[PDB]
Structure formats: structure tokens, C-alpha cells
Design a protein around this ligand. Structure first.
Ligand SMILES: NC(=O)c1ccc[n+]([C@@H]2O[C@H](COP(=O)([O-])OP(=O)(O)OC[C@H]3O[C@@H](n4cnc5c(N)ncnc54)[C@H](OP(=O)(O)O)[C@@H]3O)[C@@H](O)[C@H]2O)c1
Ligand SMILES: N[C@@H](CCC(=O)O)C(=O)O
Ligand SMILES: N[C@@H](CCC(=O)O)C(=O)O
Length: 416
């Protein structure tokens, strides 16, 4: 199951719903630049180990490419290419002057010390310097990379760059001390909450007092539940982790559950709550269900059993296309994954804007701008959903690919 293959198939399926020339589709099926580099670092024992690093820039018709860096032992070039392709549509659906791109190093960072991690980050920047920049390619944190590594990478880039321009804007997700942006820790959850609110408004539902079930209790799931309870006033009845689920009709307090999970490593056996598992958790009678964990969790095996009026796909591809079908004919509004979790990329654009301008904002300004962006993106996707009578996801693909195609035509890359 080649990751890249799946992305190309999804793009073709999408192109089956819109008027796009075959030359433009052939252009969009290939990354515009792929860079594979050797990343040599000096280990703590004195030896030199060489790692494999990637930087894929799928498309830059709309502006500089944007995408995170993954440090995973199972990283492959095809995975990076597929993720860069998805990043293109993600920045296009939420309307950002960005293209799509992604990077990665095939490494197990859990067995690297802090000094070796810093050496790896600096060596990666020294290797890929010639294809990145504030107006060329802006990396960001991703799987097993965090703001600390982002700061190390920014410092190395500034050292090579001799401070001749906005070196802060070369990479996002930085610490606040060095050009970091506020509201960035709860970006994804805030965007998901905004999309859920707009979806409820579209469906004619006032969310105050109804049930939400969240699967996955990392930063995304926990903050999704928390912001749901405060901003949307909904009742959080079920949460789960990489172990099991906890359900309470009266409502769970996300802060207490987070304390429980930190203390014991799992959310299981929470006081005054029935312990359950993920499979039966996916089908509680709730108004909103927010899968925020590992991919491929809703499948034709249990798609019919889903009873949530609104499904917000915080995670990347939690729902299979077949389940997309059954959920559609069941009457359930799905927020597509790369529209729902648009908060992350959105915030990163805001941070870049701040770095380029040299002027930073506050929490309220970031929050308001994110609200407007996510509301507009959701409403465009939903209006395409209505007008073309296609799936929500397919509408997101229509919006994003239409924007990229228009940008490609405007530059004259494709003459038709
Ligand atoms: O970025 P991000 O913060 O959103 O990513 P993230 O921090 O890695 O979020 C991962 C979350 O999904 C959970 N998870 C990973 N594999 C799972 C599985 N097979 N089944 C159920 N839950 C799983 C993790 O549980 P754990 O944190 O318990 O591992 C964690 O709650
Ligand atoms: N992996 C992140 C990167 C976004 C960013 O550039 O901040 C995402 O697209 O969700
Ligand atoms: N990768 C995250 C969602 C996307 C993000 O946080 O950037 C998850 O699966 O929970």
C-alpha cells in the first residue's frame, strides 16, 4: 500500500468531479522537486553516523511551500511525497499563499541524546539549506519533532544565512523567545472546534448541552474535548487513549482525565466512569465524534454503527472512502480531515506573517484570525458540497485543486 500511490489515486478520484485538463493533472501527480540528502552527525561515542534526510516540495504555484519534518524510523520517501501532496491541498483549502512540501529523517530519535539530536537538526539544515528559505520552503514541527528542534534548526539556518534577511521566518513552530507565535499549542484543536461549530450551524444545531465523544487523548484530542466543553458548551462523555476508553453519561472533566493519564500513563479506570474500549467507543449516541488518534479507525465493518450527527476527523485519514459513502447515505456531516485539522498549518502561516513583518500579535488577534480563516474554509467546502452534490471530502479536494490549478494557469505553466 504505497502512500504516494494512494495520494495520487485520491487526486484522480477528485479530478473526476471537476473540469481540469489532463496536462494539469499530470503536473499535479508529480512533486516538483525532491531532495534526498545524507545527514552525517558525530555520535556521543565519537563515531560518525550518516542518516537519510528528505525534503519534498510538491508544488509552489501559490507561494512558498510549507510542511513539517518527521523523525521516524519507518520514514520513507514515498510517505514524505504523499504528505507533501496532502500539504498542498491543506494549504489550498484554507487559502494560504503557500505551496506544499514536507521533510523527514529516517531516525529513531528516542535513542538519540539531546546533543545528538541538536547535531542531527543542524546537519539536516546544513544539508538542505539550498532548497529552503523564508520565501522558498518553510519547515515546521511534525512527528517526533518539537519546538526545541525548530529553534536549533532556525539558529543553524541563521548562522549559514549570515543574518541577511528574516531568518526567523524560515521555520515555524519555534519557541516564543525566538520568533515563536502564541496560540500555537492549541491550534489544531481550536480549528477543529471552529469547524464543528460551523457544521452545527449548517445542520441547524445549537451545540450547548449535547454530547461529544473524542477518541485519542494526546494534545489534539485532549484540547479538542476541553475547548468543546468551554467554547461549545458540549458535554464530553467518552475519551480514550492507546489502551482503552472511559465513558460517563454525566460528562468527564478533561483536566482531571489528563491528570489521571499523566499520573498512571493511561486514562483507564477513571473514578465514577465505565471503562470501555475504542471499538465500542466509536459508536456512542453523541452529537459530535472526534477521532484524534491512529489512522484507519472507521471502516465498512463498523461504519453503519456510527451514530454521531457530526464527525470531525482531527486525525489524518481516520475514515475509509467506503465508510465515507455509508456515512453519507446515513445522513451524517463529515468534516474532511485536511479541512478539520487546518488549525496547525493556519497558525504556522500566522507565525510566518509575524516573522516576515517583524511585528507580533497577541492571543486574541491570533484567535480571531484563525476563527475567520476556518469558518471561511468550512463554508466554501460545504457550499461546494451542496452545489456539486458530492462528498464533503470531495468538495475539499475540489476547492483546493481548483485553487492550485488556477495558480498554475496564471503562471502559464499549463496552457489549458
Ligand atoms: O500531533 P498529535 O499530538 O495529535 O499526535 P499524538 O500526540 O502522537 O497523539 C497520539 C494519541 O493517539 C493515541 N494513539 C496512538 N496509537 C493509538 C492507537 N493504536 N489506538 C488508540 N489510540 C492511539 C496516543 O495514545 P498514547 O499517548 O497513550 O500513546 C495519543 O493519545
Ligand atoms: N504536519 C503538520 C505541519 C503543518 C505546519 O506546517 O505547521 C500539519 O500539516 O498538520
Ligand atoms: N497527526 C495528528 C493530527 C495532525 C496534527 O496534529 O498535526 C494526529 O494524528 O493526532
Amino acid at each position: 500500500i504505497d502512500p504516494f500511490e494512494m495520494a495520487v489515486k485520491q487526486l484522480e478520484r477528485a479530478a473526476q468531479y471537476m473540469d481540469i485538463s489532463e496536462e494539469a493533472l499530470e503536473w499535479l501527480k508529480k512533486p516538483m522537486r525532491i531532495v534526498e540528502v545524507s545527514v552525517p552527525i558525530e555520535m556521543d561515542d565519537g563515531s560518525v553516523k550518516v542518516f537519510t534526510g528528505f525534503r519534498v516540495q510538491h508544488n509552489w504555484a501559490r507561494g512558498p511551500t510549507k510542511g513539517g519534518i518527521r523523525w521516524h524510523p519507518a520514514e520513507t520517501l514515498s510517505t514524505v511525497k504523499a504528505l507533501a501532496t496532502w500539504m498542498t491541498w491543506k494549504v489550498a483549502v484554507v487559502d494560504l499563499p503557500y505551496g506544499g512540501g514536507k521533510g523527514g529523517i529516517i531516525v529513531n530519535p528516542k535513542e538519540l541524546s539531546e546533543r545528538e539530536q541538536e547535531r542531527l537538526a543542524r546537519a539536516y539544515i546544513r544539508a538542505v539549506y539550498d532548497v529552503i528559505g523564508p520565501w522558498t520552503d518553510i519547515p515546521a514541527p511534525d512527528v517526533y519533532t518539537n519546538p526545541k528542534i525548530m529553534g536549533w534548526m532556525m539558529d543553524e539556518y541563521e548562522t549559514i544565512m549570515r543574518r541577511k534577511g528574516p531568518a526567523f521566518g524560515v521555520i515555524t513552530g519555534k519557541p516564543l523567545s525566538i520568533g515563536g507565535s502564541l496560540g500555537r499549542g492549541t491550534a489544531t484543536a481550536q480549528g477543529a472546534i471552529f469547524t464543528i461549530r460551523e457544521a452545527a450551524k449548517a445542520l441547524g444545531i445549537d451545540l450547548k448541552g449535547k454530547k461529544i465523544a473524542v477518541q485519542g487523548y494526546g494534545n489534539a484530542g485532549y484540547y479538542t474535548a476541553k475547548l468543546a466543553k468551554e467554547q461549545l458548551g458540549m458535554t464530553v462523555v467518552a475519551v480514550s487513549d492507546s489502551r482503552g476508553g472511559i465513558y460517563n453519561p454525566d460528562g468527564l472533566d478533561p483536566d482531571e482525565v489528563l491528570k489521571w493519564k499523566r499520573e498512571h500513563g493511561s486514562v483507564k479506570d477513571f473514578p465514577g466512569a465505565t471503562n470501555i474500549t475504542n471499538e465500542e467507543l466509536l459508536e456512542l449516541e453523541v452529537d459530535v465524534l472526534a477521532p484524534a488518534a491512529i489512522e484507519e479507525v472507521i471502516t465498512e465493518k463498523n461504519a453503519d454503527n456510527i451514530k454521531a450527527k457530526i464527525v470531525a476527523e482531527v486525525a489524518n485519514g481516520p475514515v475509509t472512502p467506503e465508510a465515507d459513502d455509508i456515512l453519507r447515505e446515513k445522513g451524517i456531516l463529515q468534516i474532511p480531515d485536511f479541512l478539520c485539522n487546518a488549525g496547525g498549518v493556519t497558525v504556522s502561516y500566522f507565525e510566518w506573517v509575524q516573522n516576515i513583518n517583524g511585528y507580533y500579535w497577541t492571543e486574541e488577534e491570533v484567535r480571531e484570525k484563525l476563527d475567520k480563516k476556518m469558518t471561511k474554509a468550512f463554508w466554501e467546502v460545504y457550499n461546494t458540497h451542496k452545489d456539486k452534490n458530492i462528498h464533503m471530502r470531495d468538495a475539499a479536494y475540489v476547492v483546493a485543486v481548483s485553487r492550485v490549478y488556477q495558480a498554475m494557469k496564471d503562471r502559464g505553466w499549463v496552457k489549458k
